[PDB]
Amino acid sequence: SVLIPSHAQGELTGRGHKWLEGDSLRTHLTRVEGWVWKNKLLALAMVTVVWLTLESVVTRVAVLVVLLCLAPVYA
Amino acid sequence: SVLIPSHAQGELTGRGHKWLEGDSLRTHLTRVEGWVWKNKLLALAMVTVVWLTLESVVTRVAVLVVLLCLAPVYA
Amino acid sequence: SVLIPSHAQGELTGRGHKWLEGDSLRTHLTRVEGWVWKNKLLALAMVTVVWLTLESVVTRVAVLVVLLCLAPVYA
Amino acid sequence: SRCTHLENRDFVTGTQGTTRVTLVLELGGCVTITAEGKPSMDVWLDAIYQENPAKTREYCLHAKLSDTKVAARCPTMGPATLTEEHQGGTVCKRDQSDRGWGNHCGLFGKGSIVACVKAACEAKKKATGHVYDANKIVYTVKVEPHTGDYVAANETHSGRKTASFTVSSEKTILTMGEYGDVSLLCRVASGVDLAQTVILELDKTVEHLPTAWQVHRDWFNDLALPWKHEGAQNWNNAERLVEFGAPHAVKMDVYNLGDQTGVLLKALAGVPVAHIEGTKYHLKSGHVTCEVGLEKLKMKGLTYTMCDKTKFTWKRAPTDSGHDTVVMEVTFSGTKPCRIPVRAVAHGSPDVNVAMLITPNPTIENNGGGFIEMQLPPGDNIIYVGELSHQWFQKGSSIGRVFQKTKKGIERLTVIGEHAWDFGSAGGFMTSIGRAMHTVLGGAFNTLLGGVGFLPKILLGVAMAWLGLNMRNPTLSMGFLLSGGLVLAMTLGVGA
Amino acid sequence: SRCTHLENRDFVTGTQGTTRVTLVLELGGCVTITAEGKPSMDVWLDAIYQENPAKTREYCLHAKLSDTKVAARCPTMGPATLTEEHQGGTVCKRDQSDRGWGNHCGLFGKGSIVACVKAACEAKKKATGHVYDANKIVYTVKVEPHTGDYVAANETHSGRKTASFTVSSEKTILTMGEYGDVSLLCRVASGVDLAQTVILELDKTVEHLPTAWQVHRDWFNDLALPWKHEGAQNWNNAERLVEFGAPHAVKMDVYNLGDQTGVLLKALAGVPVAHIEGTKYHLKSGHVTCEVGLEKLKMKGLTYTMCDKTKFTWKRAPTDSGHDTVVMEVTFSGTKPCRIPVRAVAHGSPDVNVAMLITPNPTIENNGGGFIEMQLPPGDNIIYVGELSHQWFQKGSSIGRVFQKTKKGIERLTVIGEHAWDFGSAGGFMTSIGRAMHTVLGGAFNTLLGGVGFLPKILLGVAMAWLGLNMRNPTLSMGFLLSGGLVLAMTLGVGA
Amino acid sequence: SRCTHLENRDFVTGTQGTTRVTLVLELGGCVTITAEGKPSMDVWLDAIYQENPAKTREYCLHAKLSDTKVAARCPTMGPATLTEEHQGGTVCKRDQSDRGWGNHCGLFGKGSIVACVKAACEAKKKATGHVYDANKIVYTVKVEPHTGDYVAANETHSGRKTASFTVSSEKTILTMGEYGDVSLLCRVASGVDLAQTVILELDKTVEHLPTAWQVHRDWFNDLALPWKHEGAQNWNNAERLVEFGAPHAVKMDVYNLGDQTGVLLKALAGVPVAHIEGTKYHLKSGHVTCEVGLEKLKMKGLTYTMCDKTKFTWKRAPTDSGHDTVVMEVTFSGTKPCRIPVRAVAHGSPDVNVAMLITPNPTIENNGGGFIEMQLPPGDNIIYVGELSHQWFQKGSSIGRVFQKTKKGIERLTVIGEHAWDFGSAGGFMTSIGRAMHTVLGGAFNTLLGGVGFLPKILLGVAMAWLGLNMRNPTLSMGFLLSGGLVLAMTLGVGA
Known part of the structure; x- marks a missing residue:
């Protein structure tokens, strides 16, 4: 029934404590670096379908930098 | 000073116990992954300079399979 | 298992007693020559195949030294 | 049935009228043999041993030093000399110190100094090699019938009978009770190569190490330690554990290269473990080719009524x-x-x-x-x-059955080598080409690469394949591609 | 003059207007000042020490094990656990045993086993690190005036004077009877780098080893051994001296990997020796920049009569x-x-x-x-x-003497590095160009190739120079060839 | 006639010579059998249960924390150490606090601090998992004759007969009174996969929740909470509910993440309910396959006269x-x-x-x-x-009847899977194709994509269709369009 979304890093008392300190950037980079070692074979499918279908190194890199950062949002 | 070689992995036979079980394939492949995760800047430099200086995926992989595995005598 | 890697040979001030003289050419040359005296058939096969197959004296000499210095090293 | 206790079980069966089956029996293995209208039978190898095998070399792991002396001579007084340079069991070095009026010489320059020390092993710190004699080895085979009863790993079963085989005793007949008679032929050829195999004993007394190891002879001959043969009082090459300090005027320092500077840990990693038990020196990984005759076996109770x-x-x-x-x-x-x-x-x-x-x-x-x-x-x-x-x-499924039997097959082949073909209820002509190909190719690979490490065998295989791609001649190219791929496969093929 | 006893001596010349001289005094070195119209002086660094330096880690080189225990549970009956699994001083392994009806079980499948053993160091088998405090270190400098009287290396000189320097001491004067006074300053904050070096102590009671070794901090801090800090009762690293045998159904054996003293000593090959004297811990390699002043000196006896x-x-x-x-x-x-x-x-x-x-x-x-x-x-x-x-x-010859001073310069520049430019009776503008170019080009080599081994540095330098012979542009070819020459030139002196 | 009380009812038919019918019986389902000239029967599965299933893990939903202690050390004075680090039932963390003159330290820098706290579960705040044993499960099947009298739901009919099936049973026979005998066989293996179900229990005394839930085993073993098995006094992974404050000089806060009950009850949304009744642990989900034989059933009252x-x-x-x-x-x-x-x-x-x-x-x-x-x-x-x-x-209409009987068949196919093909009184060739296609194609989807989320499955199906439109090869294009359609259809056929 009840749902409560956690709010963004808008309010920032600069030099007091931060409770659990769920700071999103370093947390999500750590999540991505864990995911690519646990699910290590799945990145081969992602790089190969992009490398085969897209017609430049620039557009291949552009989609992979996004997609491999999005990937741990799903299972 | 003494030098005392590691025993060759070709005398082994039978279903009985192999002492410390230093089985070199699973041992050294695990060691190599742990080392290239620490030596990360060198690993990125080696894969990119080879990709920029050899003509096909076959010859690029053939030198990288050696060059990324000099670490039991290099550092 | 325990491992205690060798201390760096430079990096420290001289003009006092060192515990032993470092590996230098001495340990390298005696370890490589002592391997060629044992694996004679493979050493002869390697030098003859490399010398017959590769397209220049400089690439032959480079590969011969590389294959010899990388052979006895493993533990 | 003892065959239910072990994980590494095997089954082989005699066809209609098959009177004989050929087995390879292993330490840590067990085979159930079954044939139409004969009682199902279990066969295994329980020990390979000798009593008091011959000592080869003794090596020293920790040198005691004592009674050091030194002598030195002023510049141009000629070389310094000691009595101790001529004795047995002394290590000495002859070297030059800088000298002058500060250390009571008449001239400044280089003198000569000689320093000595006695060497002996610490009280229980030796390593001993022992070697088997084919004329005195005992292989022990045991047989058990399917009695239709059950027993634990720690219970005595009345149906177990045993036969001991050695070069003077190849064949035996065992009376299995009411199940009749079984005939075993063993041989001391096949099985463990006693020319390559050494048993290494350090100290039997220690609480937390195995009592011995199965070391290879070409490795054991090359240990860079001090060494001797049995009964000798003085050590060959005792300079392998003493190093001498730089000479300082009239004095020089003697140092150990430390205790346990020798064989334990990383040097022996992967060597099979052995066991010592009073006079007996057992191997704990090994095999024998053995033939079993099923002619004289009898069914029990075909005259009985069926149950209510x-x-x-x-x-x-x-x-x-x-x-x-x-x-x-x-x-x-x-x-x-x-x-x-x-x-x-x-x-x-x-x-x-x-x-x-x-x-x-x-x-x-x-x-x-x-x-x-x-x-x-x-x-x-x-x-x-x-x-x-x-x-x-x-x-599982009828396909899954075949994959399991196929892996057990390759796991016999990679561990036993050429003798793996002896395992079967048949011996027809196609077994001769199978055994001949492994006799040739296994001998070739072992001759060239037998002492080479796993990683350099892979690097050599990669080099052979890559040279095969680069060769301009098509016959040499194809031969290098075939032999390089084989070298990789038979390097990597240690399991399944 | 002490300078005649030692194999190593140097001469610094003070022409008129030299009221002060800058020296880099060293353990195992000795310097004479000769000055125009003033007595010649011996000057040397005689000790670098602290009383009772601070302990850092203790490591253990040889495990003692006792009271081994084991517990196991049948398949599906849930994981095994035991009282000692959460205590201190104990090593434990959790593993799966194959089980079935033969081993007193209800089902055939993988069960659970846990094994335990207590751990301690053998009574004298520790390795202890000690670290220096820059506020309590003592540097000792000595001076001896050329009295024209000669004494052996084993007797006292009456005119020899001592200065002991700490952070808490300024420019200090030593009186010399009729020769006047010498005025002397030692820069304690500009000698040895106490942040990066550690003193290593095993057992001082061993008759045939040095009493301590000097080691680098980033080598000592990451050895793979059991470790502790002073006064704690229990060992505090995941155990590397203990290993667990492959599990049987209801039992699992524990192994001890033995005394590591020898593999430690073989890994210390190449480090400087140090010394311990009751409570003082001495370095035996080290240096300080030190400034010595001369205006207060006199020649003795300039009024005296001539001899017969x-x-x-x-x-x-x-x-x-x-x-x-x-x-x-x-x-x-x-x-x-x-x-x-x-x-x-x-x-x-x-x-x-x-x-x-x-x-x-x-x-x-x-x-x-x-x-x-x-x-x-x-x-x-x-x-x-x-x-x-x-x-x-x-x-000799005039050329031979110029060659000798050339060789002695390269030796000091190799042993001492950047500070070798500060040695002399002068500080002219060229010395700033020398010290700057040394700091930049030597600092690049130290940054890029610090800690890389001697053989792989040579192989990398030779390979990079060889690739330099055929690069895509002559600007790259020359730049890489020159850099390969520099890498080898730094490696082949002391950059090992 | 119990089948008239229920929203789900399937009708089955047959000629005089059929004799046997194959049914899949489901909890909350019902079947009426209408074979030519036999008295009609209603058949259903009433319960699937075990008495006292075995406990797997226990998990803690509300940590109780007590008796906290803290210890700290000045910079360079080594690590802080405390007794409670080496006990069962404690959670600890160590960190480096800032120190200086202002908190009684000699040096400005980073010290060491450790904080310890005891951990337990609050009195009724556990989750317990239970698992079934296939040797002890009871399936209860009931049969009722069409006796031509109406007994409502919530009152008792005298004509009902009950059969209890466990792994030790074959054909049972039930005497349906004057209507003769019905013969019934249950396959107690297959259908429900008892290796993959855990009956989860929280607290049976809470008035406003179900007593249990049918959770999946791969989910229940990945719960990130503190855990143990029965009878142990200490919790594994108790650091999952303690969180530690940032360190001060000589203090560090311990915080509790609180009662997790609400997060678990939200995560369980979409999992079927289960029911606990004294010793009994019922599923309220799943099915069984039965063969029912009509041969010994008797028509009542064929010899009677007509009514007025x-x-x-x-x-x-x-x-x-x-x-x-x-x-x-x-x-x-x-x-x-x-x-x-x-x-x-x-x-x-x-x-x-x-x-x-x-x-x-x-x-x-x-x-x-x-x-x-x-x-x-x-x-x-x-x-x-x-x-x-x-x-x-x-x-309604004849075409409407064909639609409703087709639609209810699709409900069996999505709710029951491959067992949908076994429901029927007679064979027919297309059923052999249907089971093959379903087990192959559904096996491929469940192998390749099974556990993947619903939105990710739709996104992958849409991406496969996009690759089908955009990739230039016509054979690959058509294969992607066909397979993307199949993936989308099977995904949308189970929903979210």
């Missing part, structure tokens, strides 16, 4: 043995000596008993019985013992 | 010192306090004196005097002391 | 069952027992009876009877019971 069907109860309800077979045990009450009316069925048609019994003609006797082992087809079955019945569901 | 030329007799005749100098000792029977008429001449040209004395204004005194040292040109000479004469042949 | 056509009156007038059948009840005043003259006609001819009765040969008994159920064709009809006449407009 209502009078059973389960003692151990059906369970999966792990070998792709079902095991169960029944209690009964009534007239004692009887046949058990065992069968099992699938949902397709009711008359077809599908159970292959591995205990043939099961019975209850006056003292015990009523254990059964059976093999069933994949899928859903009902198992029966009179009016007891119990549903069952066999795992 | 006829009354001299030799006590030790001329011989070569090994430092390109002639040394001698005379004796006299006249009224003692007087100035010795020393001179020396080229053979066949009696007019020109060629004695460059290292002892300015020699004298006889009521209780001593008569030692002389001089440098003479190559070839034939006559040495005089009054009416005594002796004929001397001086080995 | 004039003496009937209605008790329940003809009413729609909701299952495409008409339900009615009559009362009678003549002599008993006797047969009810029931028939129905279309307006197009009064001679042709079109009543397809579900109640065969309906009767009045001395103390019961008088209820009839029947199926009528579409359109306008008259129902006769002697002189009683009632009009009836039958809803």
Whole structure:
């Protein structure tokens, strides 16, 4: 029934404590670096379908930098 | 000073116990992954300079399979 | 298992007693020559195949030294 | 059956009229042999040993030093000399110190100094090699019938009989009780190569190490330690554990290269472990090729009545043995000596008993019985013992069976090598080419690469393949591609 | 003069206007100051020590094990656990045993086993690190005036003076009787780098090993051994001296990997030795930049009478010192306090004196005097002391002496590095260009290749130079070839 | 007739020679069997349960924390250490606090601090998982005859018979009173996969939650909470509910993440309910396959006389069952027992009876009877019971009937999987193709994509269709379009 979304890093008392300190950037980079070692074979499918279908190194890199950062949002 | 070689992995036979079980394939492949995760800047430099200086995926992989595995005598 | 890697040979001030003289050419040359005296058939096969197959004296000499210095090293 | 206890079980069977089967028996292995209308039989190798084998070299792991002396001479007074340079069991170095009026010489320049020390092993710090003699080795084989009873790993079974084989005794006949007679032929050829194999003993007394190791002879001859043969009082090459300090005027320092500067840990990693037991020196990984004759075996109890069907109860309800077979045990009450009316069925048609019994003609006797082992087809079955019945569901598939048997096959081949072809209830002509190819190719690979490490064998295989791609001649190119791929495959093929 | 005892000596020359000199004094080195119109001085660094430095880690080299225990549970009966699994001082392994009806079980499958053993260090088998405090270190500098009196390396000189330097001490003066005073400053914050170096102690009671070793901090902090800090009862790293045998059904054996002392000693091969003396911990390699001032000095006896030329007799005749100098000792029977008429001449040209004395204004005194040292040109000479004469042949050449000072410069620049530019009686503008270019180009090599091994540095440098022979542009070819030359040149001196 | 009480009811049919029917029986489902000339039966699965299933893990939802302690050390004074680090039931963390003159330290820098706290579960705040043993599961199947009397839900019918199936059973036989014997066989293996289900329990005393949940085993072993197995006094992973504050100089806060009950109850959304009753642990989900044999069933009352056509009156007038059948009840005043003259006609001819009765040969008994159920064709009809006449407009159409019977087949296929092909009284060739295609294609989808989330599955299916449109090869294009469509159809066929 009840749902409560956690709010963004808008309010920032600069030099007091931060409770659990769920700071999103370093947390999500750590999540991505864990995911690519646990699910290590799945990145081969992602790089190969992009490398085969897209017609430049620039557009291949552009989609992979996004997609491999999005990937741990799903299972 | 003494030098005392590691025993060759070709005398082994039978279903009985192999002492410390230093089985070199699973041992050294695990060691190599742990080392290239620490030596990360060198690993990125080696894969990119080879990709920029050899003509096909076959010859690029053939030198990288050696060059990324000099670490039991290099550092 | 325990491992205690060798201390760096430079990096420290001289003009006092060192515990032993470092590996230098001495340990390298005696370890490589002592391997060629044992694996004679493979050493002869390697030098003859490399010398017959590769397209220049400089690439032959480079590969011969590389294959010899990388052979006895493993533990 | 002792064959149910071990994980590394095997099964082989004689066809209609097959009187003889050839086995390879291994330490830590066990074989059930079955043939039409003969009692199912278990065979295994229990020990390979000798008593008090011959000592080869002794090596020293920790040198005691004592009674050091030094002598030195002023510049141009000639070389310094000691009596101790001529004795046995002394290590010495001759070297030059800088000298002058500050250290009571008449001239500034280089003198000469000689320093000495005695060497001996610390009280229990030796390493001893021992070697087997083919004329005195004992191989021990044991045989057990399927009695239809059950016993633990720590229970004495009346049906076990044993025969000891050595070069003077190849053949024996064993009386298996009412099950008749079995004939074993062993040989001391096949099995462990006693020319390459050394048993290494350090100290038997220690609480937390194995008592010995199975070391290779070409490695053991090359240990860069001090060494001797038995009974000798003084050590060859004792300079391997002493180093001498830089010379300082009239004094010089002697140092150990430390205790346990020798064989334990990383040097022996992967070497098979051995065992010592009073006078006996056992190997603990090894095999023998052995032939079993099934002519003189007898079924028990084909004259008995079948049980009264209502009078059973389960003692151990059906369970999966792990070998792709079902095991169960029944209690009964009534007239004692009887046949058990065992069968099992699938949902397709009711008359077809599908159970292959591995205990043939099961019975209850006056003292015990009523254990059964059976093999069933994949899928859903009902198992029966009179009016007891119990549903069952066999795992896997007719394809999955073949993959399991194929891996057990390769796992025999990679561990035993050329002798793996001797395992079978047949010996037909195609076995001769199979054994001949491994005699050639295994000998070739072992001759060139037998002492080479796993990683450099892979680098060599990669180099052979890559040279094969770069060669301009097509015959040399193809030969290098074939031989490089083979070198990789038979380097990597240590398991499945 | 102490400078004659040691194999290593240097000369710094103070021409008129040199009121102060900058030295890099070293353990295992010794310097003479010779100054225009002032006595010659010996100067050297005699010790670097602390009383009771702070302990860092203790490691253990040899495990003692006791009270091993094991517990196991049948398949599906849940994981095994035991009381010692959560205590201190204990090593544990959790693993899966194959189980089935033969091992007293209800089912065939993987069960659970846990094994435990207590751990301790054997009584003398520790390795202890100690670390220096820059506020409590003591550097000792000594000076000895050229009294013209000669003493052995094993006896006292009455004129030898000691200065002990700490962070808590400024420019300090040593009185020297009639020679005046010498005024001396030691920069304790600019000697050894106490942040990066550790003193390693095993057992001091061992008769045939040095008492301590000097090691780098980022080697000592990441050894793979059991470790602890002082006064704690239990060992505090995941255990590397203990190993667990492959599990049986109800039992699992525990192994001890033995004494590591030898693999430690073999890994320390190449490090400097240190020393321990009751409570003082001494470095045996090290240096300090130190500044020595001369305006307060005097020549003794410049008013004294000349000697009777006829009354001299030799006590030790001329011989070569090994430092390109002639040394001698005379004796006299006249009224003692007087100035010795020393001179020396080229053979066949009696007019020109060629004695460059290292002892300015020699004298006889009521209780001593008569030692002389001089440098003479190559070839034939006559040495005089009054009416005594002796004929001397001086080995060498002007080219040989320039080569000797060239070699000695490269040796100090190799041993001491950047600070070697600060040695001398001068500080002219070129020395700033030298120290700057050394700091930048040597700092690049240290940054890029610090900690890389000697063999792989050579292989990398040779390969990079060889690739330099065929690069895509001559600008890249030349730049890489020059950098490969630099990498090898730094490696082949001391960059190992 | 219990099948009239339930929203799900399937009808099965057959000729005189059929003898046997194969059914899949489901919790909350029901079946009526209508074989030619046999008395009709209602059949259903009433319960799947075990008494006292074995506990797997226990998890803690609300940590209780107590007796916290903290210890700290000055910079360079080594690590802080405390007794509570080496006990069961404590959680600890160590960190580097800032220190200086202002908190009684000699140096400015980073110290060391450790904080310890005891951990437990609050009194009723556990989750317990339970798992079934296939040797002890009871399935209860019930059978009811169409006796022509109406007994409501929530009251007791005398004609119901019960059979309890466990792994030790074959064909049972139930005496259905005067209607003869029904023979019934249950396959206790397959359908529900008992290795993959955990019955989760929180607290049975809470008034406003289900007593248990049917959770999946791969999910239940990945719960990131503190855990143990039964009878142990200490919790593994207790650091999952403690969180530690940032360090101060000589203090560090311990925080509790609180009662997790609400997060678990939200995560369980979409998991079927289960029920606990004293010792019994029921599923309320799943199915079994049965074969039911009709051969020994007897028609009651074939020998009786007809009723007087004039003496009937209605008790329940003809009413729609909701299952495409008409339900009615009559009362009678003549002599008993006797047969009810029931028939129905279309307006197009009064001679042709079109009543397809579900109640065969309906009767009045001395103390019961008088209820009839029947199926009528579409359109306008008259129902006769002697002189009683009632009009009836039958809803729906022949094409509508084909649709509803097709649609309920798709519900079996999505809710039951491959077992949907086994529901039927006779064989037919396309059923052999259907099971093969379903087990192959559903096996491929469940192998490749099984556990993937619903939105990710749709996104991958849409991406596969996009690759099908954009990639240039026509064979790969068509293969991607076909396979993307199949992936989307099977995904949308299970939903979220």
